[PDB]
Symmetry: C2
Subunit: 265 residues, 2 copies
């Protein structure tokens, strides 16, 4: 038999991994370049996602404008989120330089009336004096990609109780489960260990096999062949009647993007 694999699902696996590690810049770049989305969204929800992740904030405001007429919608918070992200992106474009400064000032004047407090507007004004918006302590790790991701998540939580988004197909078959890439890599390493054990015993150890794992190369550079499966089938049935693993993962860190320029142009 012939197994068929689709690279879009491998891209979904690595996209889920990037989202798990909060590598949102790489995630957005991969979505833009491969056109693959690890998720299933309704048409309106998907359109709002595409608008927010592309910095088209005025189109976001117009697309969600019909939802502002209702009572318990809190349009002030939605407009605040959208206009604050727009102003931060305008200020970020201006820090990389008379036109961007004007746009930042206009965005600040627009969000003037939607701020929760008067001190928040003063903070957003003081952000104009700084040579780069990342100088503020509350904005040290601000970047357009993860900001767009968080903004889309917040707007989705806000508008979810108004526009139906659950009336969709089951995400099983269009999404990775949970750490699917990591689990498949672990299972492939265990498969390599089992094949190495079967090859070592037939050609003349317990923990040395588990300690001989090479993630990057795999020790013996072999390929994919249906041997262990066919070997387990030929075994007699009287063997299956007889009879966890501590995985220590090591996280990483990278000490700290001009995405909104591609949205304006």
């Amino acid at each position: 038999e012939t197994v068929n694999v689709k690279e879009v699902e491998i891209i979904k696996l690595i996209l889920d991994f990037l989202n798990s590690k909060k590598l949102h810049i790489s995630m957005l770049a991969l979505e833009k370049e491969s056109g693959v989305i690890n998720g299933l969204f309704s048409d309106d929800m998907l359109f709002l996602r595409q608008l927010i992740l592309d910095g088209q904030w005025d189109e976001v405001l117009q697309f969600i404008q019909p939802l502002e007429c209702m009572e318990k919608f809190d349009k002030k918070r939605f407009r605040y989120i959208i206009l604050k992200q727009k102003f931060l992106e305008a200020l970020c474009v201006n820090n990389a330089m008379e036109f961007t400064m004007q746009e930042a000032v206009q965005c600040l004047h627009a969000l003037e009336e939607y701020c929760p407090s008067k001190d928040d507007y003063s903070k957003l004004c003081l952000l104009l004096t700084l040579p780069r918006l990342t100088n503020h302590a509350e904005f040290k790790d601000w970047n357009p990609s993860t900001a767009r991701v968080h903004c889309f998540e917040e707007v989705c939580v806000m508008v979810a109780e108004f526009i139906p988004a659950d009336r969709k197909l089951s995400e099983a078959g269009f999404k990775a489960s949970n750490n699917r890439l990591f689990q498949l890599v672990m299972k492939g390493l265990l498969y390599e260990c089992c094949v190495e054990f079967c090859q070592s015993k037939a050609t003349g150890t317990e923990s040395e096999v588990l300690l001989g794992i090479d993630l990057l190369c795999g020790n013996g550079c072999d390929d994919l062949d249906l041997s262990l499966l066919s070997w387990l089938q030929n075994l007699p049935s009287s063997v299956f009647s007889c009879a966890m693993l501590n995985i220590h993962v090591d996280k990483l860190l990278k000490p700290t993007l001009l995405t909104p320029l591609i949205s304006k142009l």
Copy 2:
């Protein structure tokens, strides 16, 4: 109960190898810059040269590799040719992205003057001059799917092959093998197949049913597996001692080249 150690840096190395294999170099560079991980064994000078070439710092590259121009086993014409050609292509690209404030045209003419003495043939320089009358560098017949990031990666590969003779570096156990991520994912799928087979005969299956029941996005039953199969094979008696796969290639959208045609402008603003 023994424990294994897994570096997520190496998983990201596998992901970067997979991204390079499919020419997804924009997201590859984004992942490198965001995670601080480079898939490969490079010296501190090699890493800085990679950084300069990928960030479009062409004059910095020329100043950096200048001490190597005097060596005998080092070609000076080809290196300067490719570096200045990438510089000129990026200048023409930032010129194609633009009121009348176009000093980028003068800068591109300067770049074309710089590489005039390094072209391999007069016809090649005439072709490079014919790109000035085109309103779009990628609208040319010989530049249909040209990509700045991909061109930067290829230029770095060429310059690395060139300057590899000097300032080199530890074995090659710092980068993943060819399509290592794909091989490991396929092996994990076959491991799931073997586990479901061992769970089937010992309880309640054919050779083709396990292959048809394979699932990439979701597990067989989301069974979080351990060394159960390994411990089973480990205590077996001593008397107990091909596949063609079709991969559907990606059809990435056209909106990627139009988007990446602004990366030279980003490098010029950095």
